[PDB]
Design a protein around this ligand. Structure first.
Ligand code: AGS
Ligand code: MG
Lengths: 320, 82, 149, 59
DNA sequence: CCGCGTTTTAACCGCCAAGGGGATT
DNA sequence: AATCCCCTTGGCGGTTAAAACGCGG
């Protein structure tokens, strides 16, 4: 329903055609007044797509408002430098250093147009949320969404109630472990909203999502490939379609070389067999998970418990 | 509320300052990498300073009949000097 | 031995530092030139040693910690990766492969996973590829800005 | 046990050896018998040794 | 004496897995 | 009287916030 938007006049670079396609998709997402999840593969330049989106919003519209970027520290420095390289048109504030230096970076920050975008860190904002919460954010971007993949984690709780117009997640893959991560990301994009004292929900709840979706997916994973199964997976695909975005590396990167997978089964040794049997016998009746970790340590190497002794002579204290 | 034209002017000033910072960063990075390479080279050059050195060399030497004749002539001249 | 004979350079990915120490002892007995990356590595030291491994062609085996791979770094110079033990999170193994198989690579890579027969490692591998099956059903369905066919 | 970082005779004299490991470093003073054992093992800086205190064996 | 500029590090958060409580209908 | 949130624990990897710090003057 959209087309290639004009390249920003303030964008200093040469994006690829598919980069422009992603930029158009994000532009459509913002113009739809909605939020979305980026799930494109690594190396494609999710940082580049984010800076391109910022440039588009600034250039076409008046969308130059304060924007929040949260990144892990090393990737934070890399992001800041890459932001300088691609689109230096925004006076970027780098949150960094000792708390005194943090206060110094803060001084006089409320003056309009003193900064255009701020880059912060996940644990840094987890500690210093009380400072940031006061001002709303025009456009929020969440790099490395796998860091907030846990709904239980205090990071998700701290970042959940933030006041912003539109938000964007960046992840290589939204589902590392289970459907719970998927729900956490989705509901982070579309949480409950309050208007005139009412409770309005954007998405369903975690228990609601798992009840209405996960059990059919549990049946899916129970047995490989059943009209109900196909209907359920199609329903999941169609509900996930409007908010996801992912380009596979295979088709876009046609110059990639091949890959092969190999499996080798290694037999146990006598010491390993004895230690494994003893630990399993002790664990049959204590806690069970610590015993599982000990069994894995047996499987790794027997030296993790006791090394073979360095035999040496007994020493008498004093001769007769 | 500053207008979009004044906004673009401020953005251009920011672009100029950012270009300055970027070239400074590039120079710093080049300096760091070159210094690391120089330190590695200095580590590789660990030897006695300004001392006399005795060297023993053995190598395969190519020969031609003209060179053999020249060597024989040198031997004959040395014998004549004797 | 086969990898060194074929001229390939191997990458060892493990889960705990004690296995790193045991592997270091083993390959020191066998005389393989190597370098090790651990969690305690400093950021500048991490980058410098990554560059050293990429440039130097005399170190056949390079040892990583699988968990530390969450912060990715370019390691295009590899030619084969060996997984000494498996992890519960398949995305961690995916990014570990990414460290060796990424954009700019021009050599075909091989994946080796080590498991112990009739033990728990089979269960870990089952959990890993079951999660990968769930990942496949959620990913493989086309959503790359197209619906026509 | 550790990597030798110093071999300084105290002057048949005691030797002051500095052992480094992955968790810490330590400097010790060894009796002349241990010094003779180290001397005949051709231990230099950068070597890794193994001194058993009870028996005075150096490997 | 007091920071300048510094390095190290203690201490806490995410794992990440299979049960196992003990509060709720 | 049958089910959810936290427990329950090894070894991992980040990652700020004091400890303890030459030195400059
Ligand atoms: N259009 C482009 N022009 C120039 N360089 C580009 C372009 N697109 C991408 N790049 C380069 O590709 C990289 C993109 O940034 P990255 O952060 O490495 O990508 P990425 O999406 O973050 O991959 P991951 O998921 O972080 S491993 C940078 O090194 C850019 O210089
Ligand atoms: Mg990234």
């Amino acid at each position: 329903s959209v087309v290639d938007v004009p390249v920003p006049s303030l964008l200093r670079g040469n994006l690829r055609t598919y980069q422009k396609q992603g930029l158009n998709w994000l532009a459509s997402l913002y113009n739809n007044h909605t939020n979305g999840i980026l799930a494109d593969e690594m190396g494609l330049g999710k940082t580049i797509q984010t800076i391109s989106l910022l440039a588009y919003l600034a250039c076409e519209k008046e969308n130059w408002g304060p924007h929040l970027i949260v990144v892990p520290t090393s990737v934070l420095l890399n992001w800041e430098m890459e932001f300088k390289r691609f689109a230096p048109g925004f006076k970027v504030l780098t949150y960094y250093g000792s708390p005194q230096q943090r206060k110094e970076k803060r001084k006089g920050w409320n003056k309009p147009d003193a900064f255009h975008v701020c880059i912060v860190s996940y644990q840094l904002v987890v500690q210093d949320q009380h400072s940031f919460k006061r001002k709303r954010w025009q456009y929020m971007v969440l790099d490395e969404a796998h860091n907030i993949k846990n709904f239980r984690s205090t990071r998700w709780q701290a970042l959940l109630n933030f006041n912003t117009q539109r938000r964007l997640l960046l992840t290589g893959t939204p589902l590392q472990n289970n459907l719970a991560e998927l729900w956490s990301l989705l509901y982070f994009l579309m949480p409950q909203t309050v208007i005139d004292g009412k409770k309005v929900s954007g998405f369903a709840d975690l228990d609601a999502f798992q009840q209405w979706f996960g059990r059919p997916v549990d049946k899916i994973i129970e047995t490989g490939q059943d009209k109900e199964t196909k209907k359920t997976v199609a329903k999941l695909h169609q509900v996930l379609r409007p908010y996801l975005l992912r380009r596979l590396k295979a088709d876009v990167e046609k110059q990639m070389p091949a890959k092969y997978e190999h499996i080798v089964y290694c037999k146990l040794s006598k010491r390993q067999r004895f230690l494994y049997d003893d630990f399993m016998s002790r664990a049959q009746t204590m806690s069970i998970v610590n015993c599982l970790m000990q069994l894995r340590k047996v499987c790794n190497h027997p030296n993790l418990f006791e090394v073979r002794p360095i035999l040496t002579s007994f020493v008498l204290e004093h001769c007769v | 509320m500053l207008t979009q034209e004044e906004r673009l002017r401020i953005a251009k000033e920011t672009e100029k300052l950012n270009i300055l910072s970027l070239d400074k960063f590039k120079e710093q990075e080049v300096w760091k990498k070159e210094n690391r390479l120089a330190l590695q080279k200095r580590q590789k050059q660990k030897f006695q300073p300004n001392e006399t050195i005795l060297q023993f060399l053995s190598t395969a030497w190519l020969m031609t009949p003209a060179m053999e004749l020249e060597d024989r002539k040198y031997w004959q001249e040395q014998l004549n000097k004797r | 031995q086969q990898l060194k004979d074929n001229g390939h350079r191997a990458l060892i990915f493990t889960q705990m530092t004690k296995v790193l120490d045991v592997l270091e002892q083993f390959l020191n007995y066998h005389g393989y030139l190597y370098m090790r990356l651990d969690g305690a590595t400093k950021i500048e030291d991490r980058q410098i040693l990554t560059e050293r491994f990429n440039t130097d062609s005399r170190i056949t085996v390079f040892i990583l910690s699988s968990r530390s791979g969450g912060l990715g770094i370019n390691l295009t110079g590899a030619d084969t990766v060996i997984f000494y033990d498996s992890d519960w999170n398949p995305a961690m193994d995916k990014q570990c492969q990414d460290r060796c198989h990424r954009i700019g690579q021009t050599r075909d890579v091989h994946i080796y996973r080590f498991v112990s027969e009739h033990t728990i490692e089979s269960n870990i591998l089952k959990k890993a590829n079951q999660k990968r099956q769930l990942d496949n059903v959620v990913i493989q369905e086309g959503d790359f800005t197209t619906d026509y066919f | 046990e550790g990597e030798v970082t110093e071999l300084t005779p105290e002057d048949i004299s005691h030797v002051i050896v500095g052992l480094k490991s992955a968790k810490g470093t330590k400097t010790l003073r060894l009796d002349p018998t241990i010094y003779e054992s180290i001397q005949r093992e051709k231990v230099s800086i950068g070597d890794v040794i193994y001194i058993e205190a009870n028996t005075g064996a150096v490997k």
